[PDB]
Amino acid sequence: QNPMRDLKIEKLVLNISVGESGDRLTRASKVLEQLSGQTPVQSKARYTVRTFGIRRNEKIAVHVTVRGPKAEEILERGLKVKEYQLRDRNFSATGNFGFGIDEHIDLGIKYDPSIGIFGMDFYVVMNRPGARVTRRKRCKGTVGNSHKTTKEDTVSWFKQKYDADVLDK
Amino acid sequence: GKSHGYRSRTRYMFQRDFRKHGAVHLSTYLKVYKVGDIVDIKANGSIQKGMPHKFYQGKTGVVYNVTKSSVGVIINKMVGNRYLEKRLNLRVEHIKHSKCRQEFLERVKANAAKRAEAKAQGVAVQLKRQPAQPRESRIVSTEGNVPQTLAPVPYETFI
Amino acid sequence: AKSKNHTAHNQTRKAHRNGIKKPKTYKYPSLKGVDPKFRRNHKHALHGTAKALAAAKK
Amino acid sequence: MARRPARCYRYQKNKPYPKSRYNRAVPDSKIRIYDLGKKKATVDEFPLCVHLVSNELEQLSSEALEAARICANKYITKTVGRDAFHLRVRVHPFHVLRINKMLSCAGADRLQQGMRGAWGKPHGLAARVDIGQIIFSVRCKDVNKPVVIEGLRRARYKFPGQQKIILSKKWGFTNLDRPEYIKKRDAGEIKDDGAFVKFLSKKGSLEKNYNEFPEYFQNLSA
Amino acid sequence: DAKSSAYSSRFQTPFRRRREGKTDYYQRKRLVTQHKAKYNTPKYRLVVRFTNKDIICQIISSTITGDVVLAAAYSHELPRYGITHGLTNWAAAYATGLLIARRTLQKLGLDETYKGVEEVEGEYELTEAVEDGPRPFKVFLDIGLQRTTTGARVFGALKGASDGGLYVPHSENRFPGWDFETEEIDPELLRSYIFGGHVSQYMEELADDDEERFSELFKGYLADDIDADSLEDIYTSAHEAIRADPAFKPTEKKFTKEQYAAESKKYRQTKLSKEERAARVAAKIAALAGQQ
RNA sequence: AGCUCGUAUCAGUUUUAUGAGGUAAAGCGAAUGAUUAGAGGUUCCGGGGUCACCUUGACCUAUUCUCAAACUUUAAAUAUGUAAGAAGUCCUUGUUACUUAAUUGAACGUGGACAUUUGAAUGAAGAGCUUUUAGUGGGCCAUUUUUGGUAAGCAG
RNA sequence: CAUCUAGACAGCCGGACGGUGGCCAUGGAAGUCGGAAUCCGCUAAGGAGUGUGUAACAACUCACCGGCCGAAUGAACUAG
RNA sequence: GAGAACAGAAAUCUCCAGUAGAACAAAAGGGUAAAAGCCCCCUUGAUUUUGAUUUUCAGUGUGAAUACAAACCAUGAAAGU
RNA sequence: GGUUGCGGCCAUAUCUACCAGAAAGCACCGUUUCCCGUCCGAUCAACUGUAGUUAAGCUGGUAAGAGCCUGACCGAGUAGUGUAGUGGGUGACCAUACGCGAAACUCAGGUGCUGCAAUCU
Structure with a gap:
C-alpha cells in the first residue's frame, strides 16, 4: 500500500518494580545496563500506600527505553522466551502491547553472582513514520484516524513478523 | 467581623468574561495612549499588577501621565459634598480607549468640513x-394595505 | 443601651444643599505624579524655548 | 418538639434557603415519592392531563405536599383502580424553614436571651410556588375525568391558599397540544421512552434519525 | 473521543496561531510591547525561522492590524550569491543573517556607515554607537518556538546580523565554542562554524572513511565539484557579494498572478450552497429509505 | 463678614454617542451543587443462579420533573461614569539634557484660518472663592426594595 | 357539558322467563355478595339487580321504559 | 479508558482522551495551560535613597498595594521581568 | 487563487467521522563527526535536501452533524422593572396609566475574514 504507513518499533520500554530500594535496586540497575547497553533511570515512588512498604521518592522502580535495531533485537529475544506466541490479550486499545517474564540473568546473558533473579515487564510502543507531528514543539498537531494504531493492525504486524501465533489460551 | 479589603465584593466584577479567559489579546498592549487622551477603566482580572480599585471599574478619565508599562488617569470621585480628583497608576491592560471621544472627534472633522464647504455654498449649514424632531405630515396610502381589523383575544388558559 | 449603628439618611440631601460641585480644573494642571524623566526634560524644554522666543523678539 | 402552624411559613417572605454546604443540618423531606399510579405507562395511554395550579404566591410545606399526595392517591385508587392514572407531584420542597425555639417554661428569660442570637435552626422543608405554577399533574384516560377532578379537589383541602383545577389541552405531560401530538404520532415522529416520548427533530445526523425513527422514513417513502 | 455537547459549548479555543502552534503568545507579549513613553515608535523584531531547506529571516514590526515587514531574507536567494548546497546550515544561517542586516541598513539609508566587520574573526562584539552620529538600528531576536541551545542556527543568524552592523543585543553564551567551565568563548571554533568548518571537517573525515555515505550525502558537492578546502573560499565570496549587492534583486515571476489564480481555482473544491445541500439530502433521504 | 467678577469652567435634568455592572428575571435536553421517574448499551474491577451461559450490583447515552443569598451561559428596568469644543480643530516650523535608526515622536510652544447656530436640549433664579463660628453628632414615620424574627406600634 | 316537538326534568300508577341450576371459596353462589362478566327465547317488561338478604323467592325502593301529563330542564363549576 | 511478571482498588512503566473538572502554604473568592501548576538551572530585588499615588480616609495616621525616578544587582540569548 | 513566515480580530476559526490535493511550499522522512541535551539523536541540537512519500501533519470540501456566530413582527411587548393612584384584595399579591424592556424556546442563514513580505503550470 504505502511505505510511510507500515509499522515500526517506536520504542520498547523495560520496567521493573522492586518492593523497596537499596542493594536490590542497585543490582536491578546494573542488570538493566548489562541488558540494554545504556544506563536506566530509577523511578521514584509517588505516594505512601501502607501496604507495599514504599514511601514517597524512595526510587522503588527502574525503567529504561531502547529504540531502533536494539529494540528490534531485544524483542526477538523477548519472544524467544515467550516462544514467539502471545494472546489476544496484552494488546492495548492504542496498538501498543507488552508482556512480562520472570527471568533475564539466565535467559540470554551469562549468569554472574551477587546480582539476584529479576523478572521484568516488556512494553512495546507501535506507530508509523509520522508520529513526530504530535511530539515536536512547534506545530504539535494530532494524528489522523486512518494513521492510528489499533489492535487489528498490530496483531497483523505481529503475524507478518516472528511467524507468531495469537490467542494461546 | 466585617471586611472592607482592597478587592472585597469583587467576585463577579474581576472575573474573566466567558470563553474569553487566558492571556490578553495583543492589540491592548499595542494601543498608544497620549497625555490628555480619554480612557475608561475595565480591569482585566487575569493580570494582578497595577489592578485598580473596585470603584474605578467603569469610570472614565483623562490620561495625565504615560509611564513605562502603565498610564496615569485622573478620575473624579464623589467624596461627600464635592468631587476629588484621583490619580491612578494603571497598567494598560486594565484600560481601553473610550469611543465617546473619537465620536466627538469625527463630529469635529465633519463640522470643519461642513464649515469649509459653507464658505463656498450653503452657509448656515x-x-x-x-435632537429627534417630531415627524412631519405624511400621506399613508392604502393600495395593498387595506386595514385589517383587530379585536381583543378571549382569555385562554393555554395550558 | 443600643442606638442606630449607621444610617445614610439625609446624607445626599446634605451634599446637594451646597451642591456636589465639580473640582473646577484649570489649564496647566499640577505635574505631581508625572514621569520624572519627562518632568526634567519639560523643564529643559521650557528653559530653551523661553530663550528662543526672547531671541525671536530680540 | 411540636411543629408550628403553616401560617408561620405560608408566605414567601425570605430568600430561598436550600440545603447546601452552608445549610447542612436539614431534616429530610416528609414527601419522598413524586410519581404515583401507572408511571410506567405510555404517553398514548393517558391522553387527558389535569393540573392542580396554585393561584397565590406562597409556600407549600413538605407535610402538606405529602398529605395531599396521600389523599389524592387514596381516592383515585379506591375509585378507578391503580393503573388508570399517573400522578406527578411537580413542585419539590427545597426551601428550608427556620425556627427560633422559645422556651415556654417559667423563668425562661434567664436561660434565653430573646432576639440575641435569633438565627433559626432548620425546621423543615417547603415548596416555594408562584402564581400559575403547576402543583399536581395527573394524567389519565378521557373516561376518568371527574374522578381525577374530585381527587384533585380533595387534595386542595390539605393545601394552604387558593388553588384551581384546569384540564390541559396538552397531550399528557408533553408540551405539545392534542392536535399537534396527533399529527406527529400519525406521521411517526414520536418514539416511546417508558414514561415520556422522544420527538423526531429536523436537525441532527440523518443516520441517527434513521436509527431512532425508522417509521417516519418508511412512511415518507410510502 | 465522543466529546459532550456541554464540553464543546464551554470550550474556549486558544488564539489561532497557538492552535496552529507557531506562536508563543506569552513570549510575544513581552517582545512586541513597547515602553508607553516611546509612544508610536515600533519595536523591530528579527525573526529567524527554520523550516526544512530554508532559513526565513525578516525584520518586522508589530502594529494594530498586523506585522509589517521591513526586509525579509530567505535561503534560496543565496544561490545567486554563491552558496549552492547546504541552504539551511549554520554558515548559511550566518550568511542570511548577514544578508538581512545589510539589507535593512541600506533600506534605511545607513549603508555607508555601520559596516559591522568586513573581516570575520569570531568575537562577540555589539555594534557600538558612533560618536556624534545616528544610533545603530536596534532590532531584537525573536526565536519563536525554537529551543535556546548553545551553538544553534538562530544564534548563527544572530551573530550574522550583529556582524552586519545591525545592533541586536545578545551574549556569547549561546555561540559555539562557549565553555561551560569558564566565561571565555572559543573564537577559532566560532570562526570555523561561520565559514563551514563543522561541515568541511565532516566532509574530509567521511571522504577518508568511505564513499557510500559520502555519495548519499554531499552529492551536490560532487555535482558542482567543490571540495573541503573550497567551502571557506565560497563562503568568503558569498560574504563579499552580500556586502556588495544586498539590494534584493527579486525573481522573474513567470506565468503571472492571473494565471496563478486560474490554475489554482481549477484544481480546487467548490462549496455547495443551500440549494445543492438541500437537494443532496433530499436524494439521500429517499435513497436510504427507498423500501429499505 | 465678605472678596473677585458679570452670564460663566455651571446644573439632584434630559437627549445623542460611548462604556461599566451581574440584581430582577431566566437557565438547568449549558458548567458547579441539588433533584423525580422510567428507556437503551458491559470489562471475568463480584452474578448471591447450572464456570461462556435470559439471569438485575453499577456506569454511560438520550430523555424528563423541580430548584439555588453564599450557582450560572445569558440578562434587564432603575440608578451610574465620560464627552458634546475658542483651554478646541487644521497647517507650517522652534526647544529638549526625554525618545527615536532618523532632521523620529512626546510635551510645551511661535505665526495663520476658524457668525448667520463658537458646534445637543432646558434653565441659570447671579457665578466662583475665602474666612469665621453657632447649633447638632439620642432621631422617628410613610411608599418601594430588603435582613433576623411566628409576628410586632419589634430590631436593623 | 348532556337531553329537549321522534316529546325532555319532575311528579304520580304498572313492572325480575329461571339466567347465582359443569363457571363460581359452592364463606349464607339462587334473592340485590365480599376474589367476576357476558349471555335472548323474548330484551317498553324478564337486571351476576346501586343495594356482604348472613337460612336453594327472608324486603321494599329502584336497572330502564310505558301510562299522561305537553315546555324547557339537569349536572359540574366560576365570582359579585 | 486500554494494557504490562510478581502487582490486586491502590507500588512503577506506556499510550489515548482530557478548557482545567488539578495545583498554586494556610479561610473563601478571583486569576492562571508551550502558565501563575510540576520538574530542572541560576540567583537574592525579601537591597538603597526618599518622594508620589490607591484603599480604609478627616482624603489624617497605620497597615497593605500600585507605578516610577536615581543607583546597584539578579535572571535570560534578548526583549523583558 | 494556493502555500510559507509574522500576525490582527481570537471557534463563522473549535470538535467528531469521511473524502480530495495538480505545481510550488510546508511536512513526514534520511544520518550522528562537531555545538547540544537526554535512560533513549523519540524531543531537542547538528548535517544532507540527498533515498522516498502524500500515509499522517497542513489546507480544502461533505454531514437534515453537535458547538459557535448573526438575524427574526419566533417566543414576547411576555417575565421583570422606574414612576402614579384615597386602584382592587383580609392579606398574599394582582390589575391599570405613563414608559423601558428580557432570557430560555422556535425558525432561517453561515462555518472564517483580513494585513505585511516572499513564492508558485
Missing part, C-alpha cells in the same frame, strides 16, 4: 446637532 446647521453645525449644531438637533
Whole structure:
C-alpha cells in the first residue's frame, strides 16, 4: 500500500518494580545496563500506600527505553522466551502491547553472582513514520484516524513478523 | 467581623468574561495612549499588577501621565459634598480607549468640513446637532394595505 | 443601651444643599505624579524655548 | 418538639434557603415519592392531563405536599383502580424553614436571651410556588375525568391558599397540544421512552434519525 | 473521543496561531510591547525561522492590524550569491543573517556607515554607537518556538546580523565554542562554524572513511565539484557579494498572478450552497429509505 | 463678614454617542451543587443462579420533573461614569539634557484660518472663592426594595 | 357539558322467563355478595339487580321504559 | 479508558482522551495551560535613597498595594521581568 | 487563487467521522563527526535536501452533524422593572396609566475574514 504507513518499533520500554530500594535496586540497575547497553533511570515512588512498604521518592522502580535495531533485537529475544506466541490479550486499545517474564540473568546473558533473579515487564510502543507531528514543539498537531494504531493492525504486524501465533489460551 | 479589603465584593466584577479567559489579546498592549487622551477603566482580572480599585471599574478619565508599562488617569470621585480628583497608576491592560471621544472627534472633522464647504455654498449649514424632531405630515396610502381589523383575544388558559 | 449603628439618611440631601460641585480644573494642571524623566526634560524644554522666543523678539 | 402552624411559613417572605454546604443540618423531606399510579405507562395511554395550579404566591410545606399526595392517591385508587392514572407531584420542597425555639417554661428569660442570637435552626422543608405554577399533574384516560377532578379537589383541602383545577389541552405531560401530538404520532415522529416520548427533530445526523425513527422514513417513502 | 455537547459549548479555543502552534503568545507579549513613553515608535523584531531547506529571516514590526515587514531574507536567494548546497546550515544561517542586516541598513539609508566587520574573526562584539552620529538600528531576536541551545542556527543568524552592523543585543553564551567551565568563548571554533568548518571537517573525515555515505550525502558537492578546502573560499565570496549587492534583486515571476489564480481555482473544491445541500439530502433521504 | 467678577469652567435634568455592572428575571435536553421517574448499551474491577451461559450490583447515552443569598451561559428596568469644543480643530516650523535608526515622536510652544447656530436640549433664579463660628453628632414615620424574627406600634 | 316537538326534568300508577341450576371459596353462589362478566327465547317488561338478604323467592325502593301529563330542564363549576 | 511478571482498588512503566473538572502554604473568592501548576538551572530585588499615588480616609495616621525616578544587582540569548 | 513566515480580530476559526490535493511550499522522512541535551539523536541540537512519500501533519470540501456566530413582527411587548393612584384584595399579591424592556424556546442563514513580505503550470 504505502511505505510511510507500515509499522515500526517506536520504542520498547523495560520496567521493573522492586518492593523497596537499596542493594536490590542497585543490582536491578546494573542488570538493566548489562541488558540494554545504556544506563536506566530509577523511578521514584509517588505516594505512601501502607501496604507495599514504599514511601514517597524512595526510587522503588527502574525503567529504561531502547529504540531502533536494539529494540528490534531485544524483542526477538523477548519472544524467544515467550516462544514467539502471545494472546489476544496484552494488546492495548492504542496498538501498543507488552508482556512480562520472570527471568533475564539466565535467559540470554551469562549468569554472574551477587546480582539476584529479576523478572521484568516488556512494553512495546507501535506507530508509523509520522508520529513526530504530535511530539515536536512547534506545530504539535494530532494524528489522523486512518494513521492510528489499533489492535487489528498490530496483531497483523505481529503475524507478518516472528511467524507468531495469537490467542494461546 | 466585617471586611472592607482592597478587592472585597469583587467576585463577579474581576472575573474573566466567558470563553474569553487566558492571556490578553495583543492589540491592548499595542494601543498608544497620549497625555490628555480619554480612557475608561475595565480591569482585566487575569493580570494582578497595577489592578485598580473596585470603584474605578467603569469610570472614565483623562490620561495625565504615560509611564513605562502603565498610564496615569485622573478620575473624579464623589467624596461627600464635592468631587476629588484621583490619580491612578494603571497598567494598560486594565484600560481601553473610550469611543465617546473619537465620536466627538469625527463630529469635529465633519463640522470643519461642513464649515469649509459653507464658505463656498450653503452657509448656515446647521453645525449644531438637533435632537429627534417630531415627524412631519405624511400621506399613508392604502393600495395593498387595506386595514385589517383587530379585536381583543378571549382569555385562554393555554395550558 | 443600643442606638442606630449607621444610617445614610439625609446624607445626599446634605451634599446637594451646597451642591456636589465639580473640582473646577484649570489649564496647566499640577505635574505631581508625572514621569520624572519627562518632568526634567519639560523643564529643559521650557528653559530653551523661553530663550528662543526672547531671541525671536530680540 | 411540636411543629408550628403553616401560617408561620405560608408566605414567601425570605430568600430561598436550600440545603447546601452552608445549610447542612436539614431534616429530610416528609414527601419522598413524586410519581404515583401507572408511571410506567405510555404517553398514548393517558391522553387527558389535569393540573392542580396554585393561584397565590406562597409556600407549600413538605407535610402538606405529602398529605395531599396521600389523599389524592387514596381516592383515585379506591375509585378507578391503580393503573388508570399517573400522578406527578411537580413542585419539590427545597426551601428550608427556620425556627427560633422559645422556651415556654417559667423563668425562661434567664436561660434565653430573646432576639440575641435569633438565627433559626432548620425546621423543615417547603415548596416555594408562584402564581400559575403547576402543583399536581395527573394524567389519565378521557373516561376518568371527574374522578381525577374530585381527587384533585380533595387534595386542595390539605393545601394552604387558593388553588384551581384546569384540564390541559396538552397531550399528557408533553408540551405539545392534542392536535399537534396527533399529527406527529400519525406521521411517526414520536418514539416511546417508558414514561415520556422522544420527538423526531429536523436537525441532527440523518443516520441517527434513521436509527431512532425508522417509521417516519418508511412512511415518507410510502 | 465522543466529546459532550456541554464540553464543546464551554470550550474556549486558544488564539489561532497557538492552535496552529507557531506562536508563543506569552513570549510575544513581552517582545512586541513597547515602553508607553516611546509612544508610536515600533519595536523591530528579527525573526529567524527554520523550516526544512530554508532559513526565513525578516525584520518586522508589530502594529494594530498586523506585522509589517521591513526586509525579509530567505535561503534560496543565496544561490545567486554563491552558496549552492547546504541552504539551511549554520554558515548559511550566518550568511542570511548577514544578508538581512545589510539589507535593512541600506533600506534605511545607513549603508555607508555601520559596516559591522568586513573581516570575520569570531568575537562577540555589539555594534557600538558612533560618536556624534545616528544610533545603530536596534532590532531584537525573536526565536519563536525554537529551543535556546548553545551553538544553534538562530544564534548563527544572530551573530550574522550583529556582524552586519545591525545592533541586536545578545551574549556569547549561546555561540559555539562557549565553555561551560569558564566565561571565555572559543573564537577559532566560532570562526570555523561561520565559514563551514563543522561541515568541511565532516566532509574530509567521511571522504577518508568511505564513499557510500559520502555519495548519499554531499552529492551536490560532487555535482558542482567543490571540495573541503573550497567551502571557506565560497563562503568568503558569498560574504563579499552580500556586502556588495544586498539590494534584493527579486525573481522573474513567470506565468503571472492571473494565471496563478486560474490554475489554482481549477484544481480546487467548490462549496455547495443551500440549494445543492438541500437537494443532496433530499436524494439521500429517499435513497436510504427507498423500501429499505 | 465678605472678596473677585458679570452670564460663566455651571446644573439632584434630559437627549445623542460611548462604556461599566451581574440584581430582577431566566437557565438547568449549558458548567458547579441539588433533584423525580422510567428507556437503551458491559470489562471475568463480584452474578448471591447450572464456570461462556435470559439471569438485575453499577456506569454511560438520550430523555424528563423541580430548584439555588453564599450557582450560572445569558440578562434587564432603575440608578451610574465620560464627552458634546475658542483651554478646541487644521497647517507650517522652534526647544529638549526625554525618545527615536532618523532632521523620529512626546510635551510645551511661535505665526495663520476658524457668525448667520463658537458646534445637543432646558434653565441659570447671579457665578466662583475665602474666612469665621453657632447649633447638632439620642432621631422617628410613610411608599418601594430588603435582613433576623411566628409576628410586632419589634430590631436593623 | 348532556337531553329537549321522534316529546325532555319532575311528579304520580304498572313492572325480575329461571339466567347465582359443569363457571363460581359452592364463606349464607339462587334473592340485590365480599376474589367476576357476558349471555335472548323474548330484551317498553324478564337486571351476576346501586343495594356482604348472613337460612336453594327472608324486603321494599329502584336497572330502564310505558301510562299522561305537553315546555324547557339537569349536572359540574366560576365570582359579585 | 486500554494494557504490562510478581502487582490486586491502590507500588512503577506506556499510550489515548482530557478548557482545567488539578495545583498554586494556610479561610473563601478571583486569576492562571508551550502558565501563575510540576520538574530542572541560576540567583537574592525579601537591597538603597526618599518622594508620589490607591484603599480604609478627616482624603489624617497605620497597615497593605500600585507605578516610577536615581543607583546597584539578579535572571535570560534578548526583549523583558 | 494556493502555500510559507509574522500576525490582527481570537471557534463563522473549535470538535467528531469521511473524502480530495495538480505545481510550488510546508511536512513526514534520511544520518550522528562537531555545538547540544537526554535512560533513549523519540524531543531537542547538528548535517544532507540527498533515498522516498502524500500515509499522517497542513489546507480544502461533505454531514437534515453537535458547538459557535448573526438575524427574526419566533417566543414576547411576555417575565421583570422606574414612576402614579384615597386602584382592587383580609392579606398574599394582582390589575391599570405613563414608559423601558428580557432570557430560555422556535425558525432561517453561515462555518472564517483580513494585513505585511516572499513564492508558485
